[PDB]
């Protein structure tokens, strides 16, 4: 089925330098295959915690996370001006990948992407992100929504090594994803865009062998539809 | 100017052996064929398809051989040109087709033991059907052309004392076609056994048991191979020598039923060792 | 038959 | 930190293991450590047995079992668990002790020490028509109720778990693999020299393979076509030893080398299992269930006795093949080729 994952609180205000925690719950057992992500406003998100415990290399040790059954919590030791952001958490033990609504906290080797603009109902569009420094057979490439004011939603996944491509439920057959291994690029073709699917689209990279979250994150491009 | 065959009870006695052996082999092949046709589960993999082709080839000529025995070997009553020439052509075609089907099975299992992964890719239903059909067409033509072609009577040539109206040229052609395939089969088995023993030494060397198990059937099947084709071919090749002994004729008549002994033993040694066939016969 | 599961462990 | 579990449908017999993946270095292999939990009130005299079984099953054996071959079994080790009969050997394990204290009483441990000479797990690529219970070399930890005349009752309620042994990278890059050859055709006095190399020695799965090819052709003969490929050949030894020659990466280069000329460049071929879906008999990494896994990681051996290891050994070697063009009876009908082969080892890195 589909795993619905609810994050609490919706938002929280905490002073600078103090303890803070954010919790989340999973409808069905996910077994330590959850990841915690950080999202500065406007900028693209980055990975914080993978495998429900470990800290991605480069993150400050001031972050930590733990699990209990299905209730998964994240702990920040202190709040600095580099901290206030929106924090997200997502499960990947079974496809489809479902994120949470998230929490907004306030104090009180790269990739390129292009192909966005305005669409008309029944129209088509070409999103394309090119990979630099990471291979197309050694990494899986995923495409994810971000509708304005709400959390991310998984869109598509391509895995060249295995030959399989996966699509989100609401978008069966609507679009197609394909990777050019010669140019090491990923193309994703919207066809017949609806009026609901209005979001900024981000493509990310994961290790094709021993999946460990969406480490290198694409900048992404904004797209909108008007009649 | 012919050659007489006549004995009140002696021809009965010499018949007895061939009659019993032929009845046994026709019964055995019928039992194998009815089991084969009873279940379609045998249709999966082409090996037993070719085994069934061999079985029907053996079954078809057994009756012809025994009928020829009881007809020629009483007074030689049959006298028309066709009733004897084309009938002997038919029985010879049966034996040649049987030994060719043995060669097909042998090469199949040889290449399976040599290219186990490539055996499945090489051996497909259309390719196997084509090869099978062209083998039997070779059998049909090699049977028919001597009858419609060369003869010491049809053309100027030398007649045979062993067989009536066939020139020696195909007495050499048939012996060659069977001998080349026989040598290839024996060589394939020898290579299989040599590989088995040459790895049996390596199990002890590096640090036997399977070689004896495989030999337990390999030695016996080679024993059948030689002990049947070797004697008949060896006796036949004395025709080129100007010996011409009628006592040797009687001995050749003795070994004529060794051919049907071959047709009897081959299905047993090719059916008993099959685990699939044995449990199929236990059940059905 | 059944199926593989998992359980906790205090550190 | 969480621990696996596999319970019997009866529910008495449950087995706990710390990790399902065990790595085997050259010096020693990580022990197979676990515990078993029951309710001995249910069985007054039946015993608990836990075994590690290694099996070289199928691998196209069943095609020849009906007359020629048979399905064998590799190292198998047993341990009793219900009674502490020895009571003297108890090295114990930190994980074992912690987990026992977690569960409490009636949790009885077991420890297995794999002999190093055993091979790594590998599964032959299953053909779609076969769609059976897989094949290759597998390891399995399986537990029975025992100490009875009849084995029928507990066979259904016995438990079994799949565990597969894998090897990781030795993180130590060796000498650059280079193959140099000089060919004289005995028809001309001018030879052709082919020198090929790889960029590095040990590759990671999914990383592109880069080959440096240099050809110097001193004779008038040219090359029609450049043939570049690696095969995944596995020595199924102590057997028929039919080392199979099956390619996994293909590269066609129609470039031609003029007489008395040089050709110097780099090709990039990547091996991947998506294209080889239609293939059969290909070796691939350990399989837990029908869930799929990547290509077989190369198995490395210790350069001591180097005895013919039981089971499957997979080694990777990439060929460069120059084919010359001879025009007989007007055009074409060339039947010559000169190839050299470069060995390499492909395996995952050690996770941190
Ligand atoms: C096939 C073989 C082995 C040799 C012939 C092939 C040589 C080339 C000429 N090609 C032809 S056709 C052969 C051997 C035989 O012993 C006999 C044969 C045929 O035919 C019958 C069955 C009609 C005989 C009946 C009377 C028997 C006397 O006891 C002899 C019987």
Author numbering:
A (entry chain L): 1 to 108, 126 to 244
B (entry chain R): 106 to 312, 335 to 411
C (entry chain V): 357 to 367
D (entry chain A): 6 to 357
Which lines from the publication concern this structure?
One such example is the type-1 cannabinoid receptor (CB1), which is one of the most abundant GPCRs in the central nervous system. It mediates complex pharmacological processes and is an important therapeutic target for treating many neurological disorders. While G protein-mediated signalling is initiated upon GPCR stimulation, activated GPCRs return to their basal levels through a GRK- and arrestin-regulated desensitization process.
Additionally, to further enhance the phosphorylation level and improve the binding affinity of βarr1 to the receptor, the residues 433–472 of CB1’s C-terminus were truncated and replaced with the C-terminus of vasopressin-2-receptor (V2R), which is referred to as CB1c-V2R. After multiple rounds of 2D and 3D classification, and subsequent 3D refinement focussed on the receptor and its interface with βarr1, a 3.6 Å resolution map yielded relatively well-resolved features for building the complex model. The density for βarr1 was notably well-defined, while the densities for CB1 and the interaction interface were relatively weak, suggesting that the complex exhibits a high degree of dynamic behaviour. βarr1 interacts with CB1c-V2R through three main interfaces: the phosphorylated V2R c-terminal tail, the 7TM core, and ICL2. Specifically, the c-terminal tail of V2R binds the N-lobe groove of βarr1, which contains basic residues known to interact with phosphorylated receptor residues. The βarr1 finger loop inserts into the receptor 7TM bundle and forms hydrophobic and electrostatic interactions with residues from the cytoplasmic parts of TM3, TM6, as well as helix 8 and ICL2. Notably, the cytoplasmic end of TM5 in the CB1c-V2R-βarr1 structure exhibits an extra outward shift of ~5.2 Å, likely required to accommodate βarr1.
